[PDB]
Design a protein around this ligand. Structure first.
Ligand code: HEM
Ligand code: HEM
Lengths: 363, 362
């Protein structure tokens, strides 16, 4: 299809179909004035309604007064909506402003330091995030560029990441994408069709303790670099032993088909799938929604590439934290390094044309 | 999703319709052994025939000996060819090696310094290049990664550039794309169907003085940063005056339609289109084939944005050089800065299955 509805009980971009491209930006707030920030949230919501329907922001990209700057920067003229979704989230650091310290959710937990972390502070944290997903990367980039412009003076861009998954024009919808290590990635995940599993593992409930967050979710972002040239020198058997699945079909060891249920005891004890599986983690289950990245080459001639990992969950303490803790001895650790991190509370949806991002928090 | 043929009198990736994505790499050569370098060019050609047809390199991505690394890294399994083209070029620095000094073409000129240049030496130059274009970014990355792997020990990657979307057109029958300043870019180019114009302005000829280059072209690459904070506070009138075309339709000033011919005297004397047009440059004409990029933030609160400019021509001295010299007074200079540069000789095409990249030189 061509557009995804913006309004709902939940924000789009979580349980809605996974689009081909990502532009993820983290923002820091520069104003101390609560009223000015609320005004910004309203203006951003109005812009998002236009962007996600394939229209220009404000009075448009051309045809206004000649002596004024155009309201929209114009680089998406002639493109389609491209299934654009715009999803906003609030970082822990936002709650030190505007008198919000007692409204930080307990489920918005700070992450511990994990073994092997090498986090770049410049590509970590942030007061706010906007996740822009679309099938055309120019549509996503135009949305972030225009939100940043509207906000100039009240927010700045802290860090930015582009990503890619499948190209839907050429690749069937039911084919699992492969990551840059060459393995199928996403076989055993929560799907957007699974309403009850979303209620159990993804959406915040009123009884969880934070009423303004009901119908929201919690997001963990990790920029994970792969050591591509080292991986590519490993034997086929070494690569398959790291995961617990074969490379060609992606079946669990000792099984024949991709979607055959794993037998964990046949895998090596420190294989990635064995460590990450819910049965190894007291039932903990995540919605993964990440994207591959390739940024260029570093100063040594090596490919700067990896996985921009995104996970949504009902509570960070019972989702990401236990699972990532269990990966302390993962065989995959030889080939990856976590180099960026951030966490966000993703509020409930925009209910109708009069509602605005963050209305349950700000009032 | 279809394949573009690999063999021909010319290399594909020049006159070919412009694909959605770019992955460009420049390599330096680390071996002094001519025979070893020739062996590499042949192995690379064999791999390119597989990649451009959507097949894995060598013996495949899986199902070999358990104790060996796979011949193909595997991340393009199950994907279509996606109009992948692979175009090789040789830089001036190559010709100091392997006894090639006397074969360097005259048309492969070093560029002069231009006012306003701020060139990063680490993301400039290179002994050789591979331009990978495709509609699927994963297919383009897979191609460059596998070539680099095959070349381990004989070549190293010097610098690379990814382009997330095209800012050029060789197909005037299709919609012209916009650059990150919001203007259509590619209206007046050279089309892939204009055989006479390609022969006059793009392909090298025997008579030009370097026989091994007959059927090849010359490439200039320029990495250009855009001052988007400065641009985004400019008025609509200011923006349109810079180019000489209106923003919405992209018509020449005064006219109604994109493809109506420019009337240069109605444009400001420093307008980009007026300065760059062939009639302002003694007839000099280029094939433009560039892409947009964004490489994160700038560390000062803003998105980074730019354009990776690529131009093909029959002789650098009669194509890019005169045009860029004429741009010394361009209104656009207020909003851009050139920060990387490289030139390459792009050899003729691979004629058939027994031929190989660079065979006319070696
Ligand atoms: C570069 C980093 C990573 C790569 C390449 C990677 C790759 C994979 C692959 C190939 C699978 C198996 C197919 C599938 O079910 O999706 C998998 C499964 C999984 N991964 Fe990872 N992964 C990475 C990081 C992480 C992280 C950081 C977490 C969580 C903290 C995680 C959690 C999981 C989970 C929960 C499963 C499903 C296990 C099951 O229920 O069968 N992964 N991963
Ligand atoms: C960021 C840098 C640049 C931007 C944003 C830009 C933008 C544009 C735009 C909007 C047009 C009009 C539509 C078209 O006919 O394509 C154009 C035309 C053109 N540009 Fe540029 N350009 C840039 C750099 C350059 C450079 C470096 C050169 C050559 C040295 C160049 C050569 C041309 C030529 C030859 C034309 C066609 C003129 C004609 O025959 O009508 N441009 N450019």
């Amino acid at each position: 299809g061509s557009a995804v509805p913006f309004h709902g009980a939940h924000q789009a971009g979580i349980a809605t179909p996974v689009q081909d491209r990502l532009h993820f930006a983290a923002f820091d707030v520069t104003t101390e004035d609560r009223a000015a920030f609320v005004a910004l949230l309203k203006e951003w919501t109005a812009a998002a309604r236009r962007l996600t329907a394939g229209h220009a922001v404000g009075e448009g990209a051309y045809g206004g007064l000649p002596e004024a700057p155009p309201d929209d920067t114009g680089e998406a003229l002639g493109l389609k909506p491209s299934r654009l979704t715009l999803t906003i989230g609030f970082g822990p650091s936002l709650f030190t402003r505007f008198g919000l310290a007692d409204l930080r959710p307990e489920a918005l937990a700070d992450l511990p330091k994990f073994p092997g972390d090498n986090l770049d502070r410049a590509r970590s944290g942030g007061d706010l995030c906007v996740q822009a997903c679309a099938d055309d990367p120019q549509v996503a980039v135009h949305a972030i560029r225009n939100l940043a412009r509207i906000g100039f003076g009240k927010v700045v861009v802290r860090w930015s990441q582009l990503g890619f998954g499948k190209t839907s024009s050429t690749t069937p919808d039911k084919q699992t994408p492969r990551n840059l290590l060459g393995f199928k990635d996403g076989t055993r995940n929560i799907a957007g069709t699974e309403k009850d599993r979303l209620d159990r593992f993804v959406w915040a409930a009123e009884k969880d303790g934070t009423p303004w967050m009901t119908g929201g979710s919690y997001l963990v972002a990790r920029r994970i670099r792969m050591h591509i040239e080292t991986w590519d020198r490993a034997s086929l058997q070494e690569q398959e032993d790291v995961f617990g699945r074969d490379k060609g079909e992606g079946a669990p060891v000792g099984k024949a088909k991709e979607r055959d249920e794993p037998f964990l005891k046949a895998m090596k004890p420190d294989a990635h799938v064995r460590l990450a599986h819910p049965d190894s983690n007291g039932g903990a289950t995540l919605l993964r929604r990440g994207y591959s990245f390739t940024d260029g080459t570093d100063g040594l001639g090596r490919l700067d590439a990896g996985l921009f990992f995104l996970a949504y969950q009902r509570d960070i303490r019972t989702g990401f934290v236990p699972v990532q803790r269990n990966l302390a001895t993962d065989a995959l650790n030889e080939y990856i390094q976590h180099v960026g991190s951030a966490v966000f509370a993703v509020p409930p949806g925009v209910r109708d044309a009069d509602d605005w991002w963050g209305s349950t928090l700000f009032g």
